[PDB]
Design a binder for these strands. Structure first.
Ligand code: MG
Ligand code: ZN
Lengths: 202, 163, 52, 190
RNA sequence: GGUGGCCAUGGAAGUCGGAAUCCGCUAAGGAGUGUGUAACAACUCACCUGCCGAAUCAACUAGCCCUGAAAAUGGAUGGCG
């Protein structure tokens, strides 16, 4: 292992940067080895997932080929766990939408993201009293026979504001599963273009 | 099975291995079997009739529950079939020269083996599994007058007929 | 009796230790070397015995 | 081999004002003032950053074993800064099978009073050092909070009661009782 | 993962022990370093990633000191040091 086997990987990345002009930059922060086995067979008709390491900053050395330019805009995104998924048949969003499977969900304290999180005034179904994660904050609740309700509603936390630990743990007890977007898609490249998942991009 | 002790059919799965005749030494499943409304004896000896007329060299064994019905299917395991692809059955009370015996062809019967490898493998189509289940040997040693050893390097068949 | 996270606090402080085979001196888990001048700074270490 | 130079800059925050009397560093921030002498270690402590931005410790004609110490001074200074901005908090959770360790602070910090560890009649007493305010916690059951500016002082004092509470002539694999440190942190976190 | 792989069944599905003994997904994961587990799991370690920024590591071999190193009227580099 590793002056030859290294110099081997180099010839397979340089191949799919030429042959495959459609590039999907994927974030796999949480993943299993049996997970990827299944994602590659569920997309065997279509895509080619390519997993490497630091060296992915060798778009420079295909760009060095006295040849390609716009590969400079691929530079800021080879950072903090990333792989690319090269595909012939793309065709825009429509294969990209069917990829989004079950997952986070999750939700953790110290996070920020997506939109205004709501908990429609629905009857919870947790064990009785269990009102202490509501009583700690402030929502109007009642024991109608046995199980618990919220008899009112509002947005708990708004966009840009931090989610506390007690307001995170109560949301994942309720089954309401928001704040997430990891193993899915980070930034597309299609012909020197700069897409942005805030939302036209799909 | 869910807030209060419910069910709603019985279509629940349990898997077992091993098999001489059946069991019966104050034993079968228990733990999973008893609470479940099955038994230890009738749904034991009906596991004979289906896991029989030749299996007597260890098995894998999925038993599907329906109310108190235990369906005794023999789901084929990759090495179990390659032990039953042998110059086969000597069985028990000799045996004695042991089960490292090892000489058995399976030239296209390993094709039929890698065919009956139902789903499991998440497969590149034959030409790689042909080598996965060809490489898992210890008994036989490949095709009439060869060794697995040198099939691994190549396989000028199967490839474009299995896709 | 004694809650798991609570226990494995005390364990951290009395049980997971290396120990010198020469001087019986008690050492942290990472030790590749003893502290003591008496044994001659040995390297002959073993884990402290986990109670059955 | 003597190494011509080794050095290190500590990045001092806008809150605090260190002012070194020759070698002796004094530090005053929000919380209080600390002092410490490096009248042993023998280095050159400059305060190069104007406005007041850098402590820089030199070391200079130093062989290996004094080069070590460049970084250790550099530490007891950060460790002061964290102490006089934030202030430290060591938590220590009492642990047992059976006899409830029965703690009771008794002037302000100062006297930490321990009946009943392992059914023992002798009531262990422990002094804190100056500037160390012990206090029995809330929001948790068997748990002390040792607050102070000085790491040195706060962690003898943890250790004093952590060590005052030791069993003898037993299996301390089995007899896992006493008071011990669970969480070294700060008062304010930022 | 193919996978209660094979031997061993007393359990050893990676693991009291051994022949062995390699493919897929590959990224990379040894048919396994261990914990431990009746066996698993659960955990861990190889392998491989994420984050950081430039020197790092291992076995020898020598120099100097430390240990091995324990004796009886009090105590001798000559003493003082
Ligand atoms: Mg005793
Ligand atoms: Zn020692």
């Amino acid at each position: 292992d590793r002056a030859t086997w290294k110099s081997n990987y180099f010839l397979k990345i340089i191949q799919l940067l030429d042959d495959y002009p459609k590039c999907f930059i994927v974030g796999a922060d949480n993943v299993g080895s049996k997970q990827m086995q299944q994602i590659r067979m569920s997309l065997r008709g279509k895509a080619v997932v390519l997993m490497g390491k630091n060296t992915m900053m060798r778009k420079a050395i295909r760009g060095h080929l006295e040849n390609n330019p716009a590969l400079e805009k691929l530079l800021p995104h080879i950072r903090g766990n990333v792989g690319f998924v090269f595909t012939k048949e793309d065709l825009t969003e429509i294969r990209d939408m069917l990829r989004a499977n079950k997952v986070p969900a999750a939700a953790r304290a110290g996070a920020i993201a997506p939109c205004e999180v709501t908990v429609p005034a629905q009857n919870t179904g947790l064990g009785p009293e269990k009102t202490s994660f509501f009583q700690a904050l402030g929502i109007t609740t009642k024991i109608s026979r046995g199980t618990i309700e919220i008899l009112s509603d509002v947005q708990l936390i708004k966009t840009g504001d931090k989610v506390g630990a007690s307001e995170a743990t109560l949301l994942n007890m309720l089954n309401i599963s928001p704040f997430s977007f990891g193993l899915v898609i980070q930034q597309v490249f299609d012909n020197g273009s700069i897409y942005n998942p805030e939302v036209l991009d799909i | 099975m869910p807030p209060k002790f419910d069910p709603n059919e019985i279509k629940v799965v349990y898997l077992r291995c091993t098999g001489g005749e059946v069991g019966a030494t104050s034993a079968l499943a228990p733990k999973i079997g008893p609470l479940g409304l099955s038994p230890k004896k009738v749904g034991d000896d009906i596991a004979k009739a289906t896991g029989d007329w030749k299996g007597l060299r260890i098995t894998v064994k999925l038993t599907i529950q329906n109310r108190q019905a235990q369906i005794e299917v023999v789901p084929s395991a990759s090495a179990l079939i390659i032990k039953a692809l042998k110059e086969p059955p000597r069985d028990r009370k000799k045996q004695k020269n042991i089960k490292h015996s090892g000489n058995i062809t399976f030239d296209e019967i390993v094709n039929i083996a890698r065919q009956m490898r139902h789903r499991s493998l998440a497969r590149e189509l034959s030409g790689t599994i042909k080598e996965i289940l060809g490489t898992a040997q210890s008994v036989g040693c490949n095709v009439d007058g060869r060794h697995p050893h040198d099939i691994i390097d190549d396989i000028n068949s199967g490839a474009v007929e299995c896709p | 009796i004694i809650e798991p996270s609570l226990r494995q606090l005390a364990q951290k402080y009395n049980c997971d230790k290396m120990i010198c085979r020469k001087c019986y001196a008690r050492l942290h888990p990472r030790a590749v070397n003893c502290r003591k001048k008496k044994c001659g700074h040995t390297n002959n270490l073993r884990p402290k015995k986990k109670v059955k | 081999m003597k190494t011509i130079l080794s050095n290190q800059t500590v990045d001092i925050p806008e809150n605090v004002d260190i002012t070194l009397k020759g070698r002796t560093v004094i530090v005053k921030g929000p919380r209080g003032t600390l002092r410490r002498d490096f009248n042993h270690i023998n280095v050159e402590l400059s305060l190069l950053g104007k406005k007041k931005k850098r402590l820089r410790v030199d070391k200079w004609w130093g062989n290996r074993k004094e080069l070590a110490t460049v970084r250790t001074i550099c530490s007891h200074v950060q460790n002061m800064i964290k102490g006089v901005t934030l202030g430290f908090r060591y938590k220590m959770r009492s642990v047992y099978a059976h006899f409830p360790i029965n703690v009771v602070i008794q002037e302000n910090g100062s006297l930490v009073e321990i009946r009943n560890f392992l059914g023992e009649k002798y009531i262990r007493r422990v002094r804190m050092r100056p500037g160390v305010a012990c206090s029995v916690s809330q929001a948790q059951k068997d748990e002390l909070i040792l607050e102070g500016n000085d790491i040195e002082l706060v962690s003898n004092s943890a250790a004093l009661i952590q060590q005052a509470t030791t069993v003898k002539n037993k299996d301390i694999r089995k007899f896992l009782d006493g008071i011990y440190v669970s969480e070294k942190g700060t008062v304010q976190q930022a």
